[PDB]
A paper describes a structure:
To address this issue, the Potter group recently developed an α‐phosphono‐α,α‐difluoroacetamide analog, 5PCF2Am−IP5. In this analog, the pyrophosphate mimicking group is bound to the inositol ring via an amide bond, which is less prone to hydrolysis than esters. The DIPP1/5PCF2P−IP5 structure included the four Mg2+ atoms we identified in a previous study with the natural substrate 5PP−IP5. It is interesting that, relative to 5PP−IP5, the 5PCF2P−IP5 is flipped approximately 180° across the C2−C5 axis into a non‐productive orientation (i. e., it does not mimic the catalytically‐productive positioning of the 5PP−IP5 β‐phosphate). An almost identical positioning was observed for 5PCF2Am−IP5 in DIPP1 crystals. These non‐productive ligand presentations also resemble those of 5PCF2Am−IP5 in a crystal complex with the S. cerevisiae Ddp1. Perhaps for DIPP1 this particular binding mode is the result of a biologically irrelevant stabilization, promoted by the fortuitous positioning of the fluorine atoms that facilitates polar interactions with R89. Although the fluorinated analogs have protonation states that are closer to the natural molecule at physiological pH, the introduction of the fluorine atoms leads to the formation of a polar interaction with a nearby arginine residue, favouring the flipped orientation. Given the high density of positively charged residues in PP−IP binding sites, it seems likely that such polar interactions between fluorine and neighboring lysine or arginine side chains can contribute to the binding orientation and binding strength of the fluorinated analogs.
Residue numbers in the entry: 8 to 142
The structure:
């Protein structure tokens, strides 16, 4: 996959907060490839000329094996340490697929979390991802 960058050299990413329902009480996290006992928000790099909302949906299909109704842009989040900029969308999950690309290819796991518990497991390694939930 070709990595893309903003004019200031930050890597362009898109991600979804993948909720079980329109009540947005439970969210899907996925395991880190580099560190499988860590949870992250599914998302990843935008391809050349790829709209952020398209990249967001593609990446959560690839990583989390879900599909659903794309909701609002929550915001654009910089990670100054890692020099990336992430567009973060709400996705209401309508389809949970059992044998998805990163499960098959790299053994990636997924799990539902209550919002408060998602914030807790992201805080240590992924504080910017915890902040996606601050509304
Ligand atoms: O390696 C790092 N983060 C990498 C992602 O790993 P995690 O964010 O899951 O820890 C990795 O995601 P996976 O391949 O593990 O799913 C992918 O992030 P992305 O593909 O979601 O963007 C990759 O980016 P690439 O190297 O561009 O693939 C990221 O590295 P940085 O983009 O340098 O943070 C890190 F920042 F150095 P760490 O301190 O988290 O180890």
């Amino acid at each position: 996959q070709t990595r893309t960058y903003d004019g200031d050299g930050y890597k362009k990413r898109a991600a979804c907060l993948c909720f079980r329902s329109e009540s947005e009480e439970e969210v899907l996290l996925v395991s880190s490839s580099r560190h499988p006992d860590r949870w992250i928000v599914p998302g990843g790099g935008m391809e050349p000329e790829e709209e952020p909302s398209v990249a967001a949906v593609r990446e959560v299909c690839e990583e989390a094996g879900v599909k659903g109704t794309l909701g609002r842009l929550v915001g654009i989040f910089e990670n100054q340490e890692r020099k990336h900029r992430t567009y973060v969308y709400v996705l209401i999950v309508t389809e949970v697929l059992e044998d998805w690309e990163d499960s098959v290819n790299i053994g990636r796991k997924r799990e539902w979390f209550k919002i408060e518990d998602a914030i807790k497991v992201l805080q240590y390694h992924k504080p910017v991802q915890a902040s996606y939930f601050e509304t």
